[PDB]
Design an enzyme around this catalytic site. Structure first.
Site, PDB file in Angstrom:
ATOM      1  N   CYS A 141      -3.303  -3.715   4.216  1.00  0.00           N
ATOM      2  CA  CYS A 141      -2.384  -4.705   4.763  1.00  0.00           C
ATOM      3  C   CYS A 141      -2.737  -6.144   4.350  1.00  0.00           C
ATOM      4  CB  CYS A 141      -2.352  -4.603   6.292  1.00  0.00           C
ATOM      5  SG  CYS A 141      -3.843  -3.790   6.937  1.00  0.00           S
ATOM      6  N   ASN A 159       4.422  -1.815  12.658  1.00  0.00           N
ATOM      7  CA  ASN A 159       3.518  -2.196  11.582  1.00  0.00           C
ATOM      8  C   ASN A 159       4.230  -2.099  10.237  1.00  0.00           C
ATOM      9  OD1 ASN A 159       1.224  -2.992  10.259  1.00  0.00           O
ATOM     10  ND2 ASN A 159      -0.028  -1.233  10.877  1.00  0.00           N
ATOM     11  N   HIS A 214      -2.459 -10.836  11.571  1.00  0.00           N
ATOM     12  CA  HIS A 214      -1.937  -9.541  11.163  1.00  0.00           C
ATOM     13  C   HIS A 214      -1.718  -8.669  12.392  1.00  0.00           C
ATOM     14  CE1 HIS A 214      -1.380  -5.708   9.251  1.00  0.00           C
ATOM     15  NE2 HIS A 214      -2.512  -5.241   9.743  1.00  0.00           N
ATOM     16  N   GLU A 262       0.822  -1.202   0.000  1.00  0.00           N
ATOM     17  CA  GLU A 262       0.000   0.000   0.000  1.00  0.00           C
ATOM     18  C   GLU A 262       0.861   1.258   0.000  1.00  0.00           C
ATOM     19  OE1 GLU A 262      -1.653  -0.869   4.293  1.00  0.00           O
ATOM     20  OE2 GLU A 262      -1.745   1.301   3.944  1.00  0.00           O
TER      21      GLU A 262
HETATM   22  C1  LIG Z   1      -4.060   1.507  18.123  1.00  0.00           C
HETATM   23  C2  LIG Z   1      -4.583   2.865  18.382  1.00  0.00           C
HETATM   24  C3  LIG Z   1      -6.011   2.863  17.950  1.00  0.00           C
HETATM   25  C4  LIG Z   1      -4.519   3.161  19.865  1.00  0.00           C
HETATM   26  O1  LIG Z   1      -4.312   4.503  20.155  1.00  0.00           O
HETATM   27  P1  LIG Z   1      -4.967   5.198  21.340  1.00  0.00           P
HETATM   28  O2  LIG Z   1      -6.334   5.314  20.904  1.00  0.00           O
HETATM   29  O3  LIG Z   1      -4.191   6.372  21.407  1.00  0.00           O
HETATM   30  O4  LIG Z   1      -4.785   4.227  22.522  1.00  0.00           O
HETATM   31  P2  LIG Z   1      -5.853   3.654  23.511  1.00  0.00           P
HETATM   32  O5  LIG Z   1      -6.505   4.783  24.089  1.00  0.00           O
HETATM   33  O6  LIG Z   1      -6.693   2.710  22.911  1.00  0.00           O
HETATM   34  O7  LIG Z   1      -4.868   2.850  24.442  1.00  0.00           O
HETATM   35  C5  LIG Z   1      -4.331   1.574  24.087  1.00  0.00           C
HETATM   36  C6  LIG Z   1      -4.181   0.583  25.232  1.00  0.00           C
HETATM   37  O8  LIG Z   1      -3.102   0.895  26.127  1.00  0.00           O
HETATM   38  C7  LIG Z   1      -3.596   1.046  27.439  1.00  0.00           C
HETATM   39  N1  LIG Z   1      -2.874   2.036  28.218  1.00  0.00           N
HETATM   40  C8  LIG Z   1      -2.895   3.337  28.128  1.00  0.00           C
HETATM   41  N2  LIG Z   1      -2.120   3.834  29.029  1.00  0.00           N
HETATM   42  C9  LIG Z   1      -1.569   2.890  29.731  1.00  0.00           C
HETATM   43  C10 LIG Z   1      -0.636   2.784  30.858  1.00  0.00           C
HETATM   44  N3  LIG Z   1      -0.125   3.853  31.423  1.00  0.00           N
HETATM   45  N4  LIG Z   1      -0.330   1.579  31.272  1.00  0.00           N
HETATM   46  C11 LIG Z   1      -0.835   0.514  30.732  1.00  0.00           C
HETATM   47  N5  LIG Z   1      -1.682   0.525  29.714  1.00  0.00           N
HETATM   48  C12 LIG Z   1      -2.074   1.670  29.193  1.00  0.00           C
HETATM   49  C13 LIG Z   1      -5.088   1.302  27.248  1.00  0.00           C
HETATM   50  O9  LIG Z   1      -5.891   1.004  28.326  1.00  0.00           O
HETATM   51  C14 LIG Z   1      -5.450   0.483  26.028  1.00  0.00           C
HETATM   52  O10 LIG Z   1      -5.732  -0.855  26.375  1.00  0.00           O
HETATM   53  P3  LIG Z   1      -6.606  -1.963  25.762  1.00  0.00           P
HETATM   54  O11 LIG Z   1      -6.298  -2.076  24.408  1.00  0.00           O
HETATM   55  O12 LIG Z   1      -6.234  -3.176  26.375  1.00  0.00           O
HETATM   56  O13 LIG Z   1      -7.901  -1.487  26.023  1.00  0.00           O
HETATM   57  C15 LIG Z   1      -3.784   3.871  17.550  1.00  0.00           C
HETATM   58  O14 LIG Z   1      -2.453   3.653  17.788  1.00  0.00           O
HETATM   59  C16 LIG Z   1      -4.061   3.765  16.068  1.00  0.00           C
HETATM   60  O15 LIG Z   1      -4.981   4.305  15.583  1.00  0.00           O
HETATM   61  N6  LIG Z   1      -3.255   3.059  15.325  1.00  0.00           N
HETATM   62  C17 LIG Z   1      -3.293   2.953  13.885  1.00  0.00           C
HETATM   63  C18 LIG Z   1      -4.248   1.978  13.230  1.00  0.00           C
HETATM   64  C19 LIG Z   1      -4.157   0.548  13.741  1.00  0.00           C
HETATM   65  O16 LIG Z   1      -3.126   0.028  13.981  1.00  0.00           O
HETATM   66  N7  LIG Z   1      -5.276  -0.123  13.879  1.00  0.00           N
HETATM   67  C20 LIG Z   1      -5.338  -1.486  14.263  1.00  0.00           C
HETATM   68  C21 LIG Z   1      -6.351  -2.268  13.518  1.00  0.00           C
HETATM   69  S1  LIG Z   1      -5.751  -2.581  11.860  1.00  0.00           S
END
Ligand SMILES: CC(C)(COP(=O)(O)OP(=O)(O)OC[C@H]1O[C@@H](n2cnc3c(N)ncnc32)[C@H](O)[C@@H]1OP(=O)(O)O)[C@@H](O)C(=O)NCCC(=O)NCCS
Ligand SMILES: CC(C)(COP(=O)(O)OP(=O)(O)OC[C@H]1O[C@@H](n2cnc3c(N)ncnc32)[C@H](O)[C@@H]1OP(=O)(O)O)[C@@H](O)C(=O)NCCC(=O)NCCS
Lengths: 415, 415
Positions: free
Chosen positions: B113, B307, B248, B81
């Site tokens: 992906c 990733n 994945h 991609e």
């Molecule tokens: C993955 C993604 C959605 C998360 O970002 P975020 O929204 O900023 O993070 P979240 O608020 O969900 O936090 C992630 C996790 O870490 C945890 N966390 C946050 N702070 C923490 C801390 N101090 N200690 C321990 N854990 C912690 C959260 O509770 C959460 O846990 P869970 O998944 O078990 O519920 C973001 O990185 C993203 O958009 N990535 C790109 C796209 C992607 O990879 N998507 C995946 C599907 S293909």
């Protein structure tokens, strides 16, 4: 057990220009485009007729005309060099616009004007491997060819889409699996860097690459076809034993060049080639009789549309079977696909007894009949429009258009 | 008769950053990236490490490490991609950089992906159909994941390439042809419009789409696997009868979510599901024992790279077989490929007796050992560099870099 193309449908932009109007506009002798290139009418687009809209129009027309059960589609592939996202494929847009179910692979294939064939072979071999038994695939070649105002490639521009139905009931073309010849090499004959809306091309060098890749692909196929008893070195050249040959048409006169080259491959490789001269071989290869018998009737659609990249070869197949499906039933024909970059593949297949039926339901005359002629002035105005500025016009019944891009999401409407 | 993956090689960018340095730089609790996401080290690139360079490095390494005869390659496909041209595919660049011969299909496959798996299946089914008998294919998953500074997706960035050898001698994974389950639907969870260098994403919505598509794909596979006698409803859940499952990995913790969801599919569809509650089903599905036995050892490489889109699943397969190839020989494992847009495919295969041999020749430890840590400050400086401004640094021996873009032609150097 057979596999190949069961049916096809095509979508064309709503507008076109007379090619002689383009010549006059550019200070060019009209005969250069009409006689030199073989062009009659050039499709032109506005931003609403994007790759998705054309692809979805064609695929939706295929499903309607051929009464396809959408839940039997296990593969939906879009061959295109006019992608609209680095990640999200046109196929996924097409899936949503057509409201197709979920049990299918979707993705796009890319290699210039060869990308559709690559997807076709992936669908064929998915079925032939048994993985697709009992199911069908839809492979859509969708492209808009754009070279720019006042460029050498401008008169070969075009756009449209051809949707192919691929199944174990290959009414149009039962393909000879495993006999493909292929020839590829890293070249810069034609390309379009990311962000550039107009293609870059070394015109006459792309012709040479075409003919070089053609020669390797045809020879590869011929070798396999000789060993399988499908052709023979006899009073007739191996290539003469094909009822017809369809070629990728960047412009209509390119089919005569390609056919001449293909026949030269036979004449140069004939065990008695030493007894001939380059003068005699070229005069025989250029045989007008052979071209008229094998190629001439495949260019009717291409001449009124222009280059559609991935879809040009299959517009030629469509033009050929549109009129001669009944006569060709049971006869083996050859197809040459080329993609700048480059890659060529030559393959063969047998036209099916029901081919005439499937082509009648495609109703190609009515597809071409819905277009409207516009002026070069209007063609240029639409050309300068940004990709996110579709014209406020409705799609035809069952057709699709891009309406706007809101928050980086593309929105479409169905007629 | 068998078909699948014979061997693999991987290429990684020359630089990386410690993920806790990124957290500190962003005012984020380090434990969010390390515990919350499961990340350790994040690959970072400069413009010289483009899709072509990484893809060519990996494929050239495959041919060298596994002593592949280049003239036996009949298919070279690049799933990506991160394309660099609307028309000319990365595969054609790879062909030229590696000086490969001409008798092969080349093209790129695109669906976020999932694009690598699509190309893998096309190679497998090309062989399984008989068209590729006696030949091999090379499928390269190459991507650079880029979300941008100060975005939620930044800590899941990465880059690299995995080159897969596909043949009738599937030493790594003899795939079960025809048993694939697949689930696709038109969605805007993650995308990257043409011209935009950073991806757009609805983070938690992409997770939901992942798990929804996973459920359909796994269930589709399970149905086919039940009818073929490969799994059964017994004391063990159907999914438990797979020795391992690789998913994945957009981020490492995503594998636990996916495994929990997969097991829920079994528990919700069990004929006795009525006797259970959502509380009991989730506690059993989250079984730490099952995750440790089936998934835990597949994330060692992913956690140090990030990733890689099309390559993430096969980096997981690589991490798994890197250490357990011998123990897994003769055992059937499952793989889940996801692509935003979206599409998921779940497939299975048997690890081969010679898998340990092929993984030893991949020498993955040495691949990871050649990287150097840089600062977040340097990571950001390299990020802001334009795509046509590679750093003046030489490639490693046998590796490739982009050197410049002259007259719209990309130029590369081999180390
Ligand atoms: C993955 C993604 C959605 C998360 O970002 P975020 O929204 O900023 O993070 P979240 O608020 O969900 O936090 C992630 C996790 O870490 C945890 N966390 C946050 N702070 C923490 C801390 N101090 N200690 C321990 N854990 C912690 C959260 O509770 C959460 O846990 P869970 O998944 O078990 O519920 C973001 O990185 C993203 O958009 N990535 C790109 C796209 C992607 O990879 N998507 C995946 C599907 S293909
Ligand atoms: C095809 C293309 C190379 C030709 O453009 P051009 O260089 O401007 O045209 P040429 O100079 O070659 O002229 C084309 C033909 O028309 C002929 N011609 C020119 N003026 C003429 C006239 N007044 N009457 C009759 N014929 C005329 C030429 O003699 C030539 O004939 P030939 O092909 O039989 O030799 C150009 O349109 C292009 O680059 N197209 C895009 C890429 C493409 O389609 N490539 C094809 C391979 S994929």
């Amino acid at each position: 057990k057979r596999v190949g193309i069961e049916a096809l449908a095509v979508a064309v932009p709503s507008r076109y220009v007379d090619i002689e109007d383009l010549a006059r506009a550019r200070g060019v002798d009209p005969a250069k485009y009409t006689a030199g290139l073989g062009a009659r009418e050039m499709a032109v687009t506005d931003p609403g007729e994007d790759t998705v809209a054309l692809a979805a129009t064609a695929a939706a027309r295929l499903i309607r005309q051929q009464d396809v059960d959408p839940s039997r589609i296990g593969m939906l592939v879009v061959g295109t060099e006019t992608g609209i996202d680095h990640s999200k494929p046109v196929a996924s847009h097409v899936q949503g616009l057509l409201k197709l179910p979920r049990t299918m692979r979707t993705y796009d294939t890319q290699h210039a004007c060869y990308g559709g064939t690559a997807g076709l072979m992936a669908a064929v071999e998915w079925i032939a491997s048994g993985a697709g038994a009992g199911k069908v695939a839809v492979v859509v070649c969708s492209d808009i060819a754009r070279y720019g105002l006042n460029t050498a490639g401008e008169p070969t521009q075009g756009g449209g889409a051809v949707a192919l139905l691929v199944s174990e009931q290959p009414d149009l073309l039962a393909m000879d699996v495993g006999l493909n010849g292929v020839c590829s090499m890293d070249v810069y004959d034609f390309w379009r860097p990311v962000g550039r809306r107009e293609a870059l091309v070394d015109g006459h060098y792309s012709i040479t690459c075409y003919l070089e890749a053609l020669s390797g692909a045809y020879r590869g196929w011929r070798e396999k076809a000789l060993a399988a008893g499908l052709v023979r070195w006899s009073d007739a050249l191996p290539g003469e034993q094909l009822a017809r040959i369809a070629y990728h048409v960047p412009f209509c006169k390119m089919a005569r060049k390609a056919h001449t080259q293909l026949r030269l491959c036979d004449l140069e490789d004939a065990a008695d080639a030493a007894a001939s001269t380059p003068e005699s071989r070229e005069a025989q290869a250029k045989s007008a009789a052979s071209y008229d018998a094998q190629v001439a009737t495949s260019l009717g659609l291409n001449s009124r549309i222009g280059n559609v990249y991935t879809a040009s070869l299959y517009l030629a197949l469509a033009g050929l079977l549109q009129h001669e499906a009944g006569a060709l039933a049971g006869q083996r024909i050859g197809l040459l696909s080329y993609g700048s970059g480059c890659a060529a593949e030559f393959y063969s297949g047998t036209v099916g007894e029901k081919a005439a039926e499937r082509m009648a339901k495609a109703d190609l005359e009515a597809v071409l009949a819905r277009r409207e002629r516009v002026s070069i002035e209007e063609y240029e105005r639409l050309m300068k429009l940004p990709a996110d500025a579709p014209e406020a016009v409705a799609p035809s019944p069952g057709a699709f258009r891009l309406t706007e891009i809101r928050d980086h999401r593309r929105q479409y409407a169905e007629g």
